[PDB]
Scaffold this active site. Structure first.
Site, short mmCIF file in Angstrom:
data_model
loop_
_atom_site.label_atom_id
_atom_site.label_comp_id
_atom_site.label_asym_id
_atom_site.label_seq_id
_atom_site.Cartn_x
_atom_site.Cartn_y
_atom_site.Cartn_z
N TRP A 47 0.92 -1.17 0.00
CA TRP A 47 0.00 0.00 0.00
C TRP A 47 0.95 1.21 0.00
O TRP A 47 1.88 1.27 0.80
CB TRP A 47 -0.93 0.06 1.16
CG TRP A 47 -1.78 1.24 1.46
CD1 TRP A 47 -2.71 1.88 0.71
CD2 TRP A 47 -1.79 1.92 2.74
NE1 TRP A 47 -3.28 2.93 1.41
CE2 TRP A 47 -2.74 2.96 2.66
CE3 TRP A 47 -1.07 1.74 3.91
CZ2 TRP A 47 -2.99 3.82 3.72
CZ3 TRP A 47 -1.32 2.58 4.97
CH2 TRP A 47 -2.26 3.61 4.89
N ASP B 105 0.23 -5.28 9.78
CA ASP B 105 -0.74 -4.24 9.37
C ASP B 105 -2.06 -5.02 9.23
O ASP B 105 -2.22 -5.79 8.26
CB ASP B 105 -0.20 -3.53 8.13
CG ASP B 105 -1.08 -2.36 7.74
OD1 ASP B 105 -2.04 -2.04 8.48
OD2 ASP B 105 -0.84 -1.74 6.68
N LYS C 252 -12.62 0.01 7.87
CA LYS C 252 -13.46 -0.78 6.94
C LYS C 252 -14.37 -1.82 7.56
O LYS C 252 -15.54 -1.89 7.18
CB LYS C 252 -12.66 -1.47 5.83
CG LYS C 252 -11.78 -0.55 4.98
CD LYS C 252 -10.55 -0.19 5.81
CE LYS C 252 -9.72 0.90 5.17
NZ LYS C 252 -8.32 0.73 5.67
C1 LIG Z 1 -3.09 -1.85 4.14
C2 LIG Z 1 -3.65 -0.61 4.76
N1 LIG Z 1 -3.20 -0.20 5.93
C3 LIG Z 1 -3.62 0.90 6.60
C4 LIG Z 1 -4.62 1.69 6.03
C5 LIG Z 1 -5.02 2.89 6.82
O1 LIG Z 1 -6.43 3.14 6.89
P1 LIG Z 1 -7.00 4.06 8.02
O2 LIG Z 1 -5.89 5.09 8.47
O3 LIG Z 1 -8.16 4.74 7.37
O4 LIG Z 1 -7.26 3.23 9.22
C6 LIG Z 1 -5.14 1.30 4.82
C7 LIG Z 1 -6.15 2.08 4.16
N2 LIG Z 1 -6.49 1.79 2.82
C8 LIG Z 1 -7.50 2.60 2.11
C9 LIG Z 1 -8.96 2.31 2.39
C10 LIG Z 1 -7.53 4.03 2.61
C11 LIG Z 1 -6.29 4.88 2.39
O5 LIG Z 1 -5.61 4.87 1.34
O6 LIG Z 1 -5.97 5.60 3.36
C12 LIG Z 1 -7.21 2.52 0.61
O7 LIG Z 1 -7.90 3.10 -0.24
O8 LIG Z 1 -6.24 1.86 0.20
C13 LIG Z 1 -4.67 0.16 4.15
O9 LIG Z 1 -5.14 -0.23 3.00
#
Ligand SMILES: Cc1ncc(COP(=O)(O)O)c(CN[C@@](C)(CC(=O)O)C(=O)O)c1O
Ligand SMILES: Cc1ncc(COP(=O)(O)O)c(CN[C@@](C)(CC(=O)O)C(=O)O)c1O
Lengths: 401, 401
Positions: free
Chosen positions: B133, B214, B250
């Site tokens: 990510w 994570d 989520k």
């Molecule tokens: C692997 C992973 N870790 C941590 C987070 C952190 O989310 P939070 O701070 O909202 O708890 C996301 C969020 N992934 C999303 C939903 C949101 C984002 O990019 O922040 C995504 O679209 O990939 C994630 O995909």
């Protein structure tokens, strides 16, 4: 040996740690005069009427819990800028600002110190008053800047050391950073006088220093928000482009909801559009986006004519009460027969009193009367009720007698 | 020249920036398949039933908005630990953990990287999968560690490069840090198989690496929370003391409320009492204390037998639906007449599909159909409704035809 066998026991927070200790006391008459948290005249946490009603509209409305832009709720963001700046303001009217929702005053203050560490290419030195709120130190140090001090309080006379402040300020190197408390200086309760402010403005502008304003008590110094923002506006109107942090923790009693904002006064609207992007780049890898509730509440209030009015009547109500508690305290001290001059109690503004008590006295206070304050002698008068003003007066007196 | 004349325009976020762009489109058929955000079958943000009811008890209760301990709501904190760990768990039963409420997954992940920068005296190197990510990079870099990579995805075969991962992992220097995604790897949707996990556990334990988990999708990989925590528990039960970040963004749809937690598995209860103090010392000068709402909601749910049950039925409901959207998509692709193999769409788990589309195709998608996704070809299937699955299939097809 493990991963963390070398991690030692760090101490409890100077301030927050008091609430923890307070928590554990079994004395039915314990009082928590540690943190700057408002209590009603029954000595009960008080959630503002305008707040209860704004929360209710939110519910009624059946709103989503979707992610907020990196920068916060626009309405909140904008309503803040305005609360700080004034609607008349050219800075605000010209859009030469960038306001980003932060995790209350602390979080804004931090986003701000991290922005500074990153883009303030003229110095690594932040100047704090003597004394200053305890958290200012680690906030800046962790963000990576250096800390310095300018004279502020004079304990001999229980007021502002204006000649010493002017001397220290007059010698701070050009383009350095200085932290000034907007109103209701913590933990002193002594703020510069209007005329004094005009003078500070001159030397700040003169030495070309970046003014960093901490505005956590707007409406708590005088019971009037516009009066509380005087100094801040006066600076900007003198041509000083400040940076500032706002908290809605006390003026709105949104403590644990965490609503605040960090603002940067720029030269142009385009400059602001670029500082904005970098602030977002900064925030993204920190907490990604901010807590929506507190901001939703604030905004509805700030932006709803009748919520704003009620809010203002309530901010007046809270200030008056602290005042009535100050009055009653000094009065009680004489009544208990205190030989001391407690004039500062009523002289001081804001949520506290910087009493002057020594650590042994603070210590005896906690242990014999179950009255919790910070070790620097700071008591939260905001937390006194009609029902225990007597008890405090008495204790203060015993340990002082 | 001003203070910020040198601050340049930074770009919009790779992910979040998509929502911004999406916002501005006037196409009545636009779809936001950028961020991992759940929509109901009407393609509307969905606030869980258990959530609506937990919020209502909070209100009914007329609770205060007072500051929360630096570490968060105890109940939430504890309920999280448990959700991650399992009640049976010796780690949990022995109290050899420290869980601190964080600003959702991001904020926890950060508190964690800052803890590591400060106390992980064995290396400055954090190993991320390929791909990972997007935010993982700046989170770690800003906290001050170095970034490395281990092979993960194989785009030729649309699955896990197990032999390459094992080779890379087998050569990571002892006591280094490795980031592993608990379940529903982002952005791949391909997770190691149970047997594969057992194998990774061995090499991690063997090389004495610190496992950083994570856990942002517990209950989204299989529709079952305990099954989603398998791998995590398996590690700890193998004797690996991990560190982990949890998001309730989520699985609970608490996105903008921001509820999360950072946990450290220690050797003893005393070790945990000391890591705890240092974590608090870390958090204090950051945002002081955390947002109460999201945590209050979570905790009431996690700790209320009937809220927990309903919550679980709803987490099942959301996973099933993504599944039905995956199915329907592939089906539509054949129906549109797609000559391509879309098997990965239904093979993949979690909220997305890692489609394989090239940037020109992503670009055409946005401009001709007003369908927004990230540039890496990642689409949020979670955001598809029965009503637009056809529209997407068709577009995907046109631009692919
Ligand atoms: C692997 C992973 N870790 C941590 C987070 C952190 O989310 P939070 O701070 O909202 O708890 C996301 C969020 N992934 C999303 C939903 C949101 C984002 O990019 O922040 C995504 O679209 O990939 C994630 O995909
Ligand atoms: C001058 C000053 N600035 C910023 C803050 C930050 O408050 P916030 O993060 O809650 O917005 C406080 C809080 N002063 C309190 C009330 C609370 C504290 O110590 O955090 C105090 O007891 O001094 C403060 O006094």
């Amino acid at each position: 040996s493990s991963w963390w066998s070398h991690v030692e026991m760090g101490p409890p927070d100077p301030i927050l740690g008091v609430t923890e200790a307070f928590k554990r006391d079994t004395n039915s008459k314990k009082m928590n005069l540690g943190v700057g948290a408002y209590r009603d005249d029954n000595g009960k946490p008080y959630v503002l009427n305008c707040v209860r009603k704004a929360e209710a509209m939110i519910a009624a409305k059946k709103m989503d819990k979707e992610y907020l832009p990196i920068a916060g709720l626009a309405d909140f963001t904008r309503a803040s800028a305005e609360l700080a700046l004034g609607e008349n303001s050219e800075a605000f009217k010209s859009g030469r600002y960038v306001t980003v929702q932060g995790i209350s005053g602390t979080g804004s203050l931090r986003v701000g110190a991290n922005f500074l560490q990153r883009f303030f290419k003229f110095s690594r030195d932040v100047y704090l008053p003597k004394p200053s709120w305890g958290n200012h130190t680690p906030i800046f140090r962790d963000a990576g800047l250096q800390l310095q001090a300018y004279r502020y309080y004079d304990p001999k006379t229980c007021s502002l050391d204006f000649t010493g402040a002017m001397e220290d300020i007059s010698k701070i190197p050009e383009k350095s950073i200085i932290l000034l408390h907007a109103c209701a200086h913590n933990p002193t309760g002594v703020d510069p006088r209007q005329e004094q402010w005009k003078e500070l403005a001159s030397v700040v502008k003169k030495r070309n220093l970046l003014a960093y304003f901490d505005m956590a008590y707007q409406g708590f110094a005088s019971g009037d928000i516009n009066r509380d923002a005087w100094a801040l506006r006066h600076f900007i109107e003198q041509g000083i482009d400040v940076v500032l942090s706002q908290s809605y923790a006390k003026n709105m009693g949104l403590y644990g909801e965490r609503a605040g904002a960090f603002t940067v006064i720029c030269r142009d609207a385009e400059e602001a559009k670029r500082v904005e992007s970098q602030l977002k780049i900064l925030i993204r890898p920190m907490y990604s986006n901010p807590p929506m509730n507190g901001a939703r509440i604030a905004s509805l209030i700030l932006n709803t004519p009748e919520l704003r009015k009620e809010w203002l009547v309530e901010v007046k109500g809270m200030a008056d009460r602290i005042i009535s508690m100050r009055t009653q305290l000094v009065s009680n001290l004489k009544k208990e027969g205190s030989s001391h001059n407690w004039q500062h109690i009523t002289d001081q503004i804001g949520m506290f009193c910087f009493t002057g008590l020594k650590p042994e006295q603070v210590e005896r206070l906690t242990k014999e009367f179950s009255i919790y304050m910070t070790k620097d002698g700071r008591i939260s008068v905001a937390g006194v009720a009609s029902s225990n003003v007597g008890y405090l007066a008495h204790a203060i007196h015993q340990v002082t007698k």
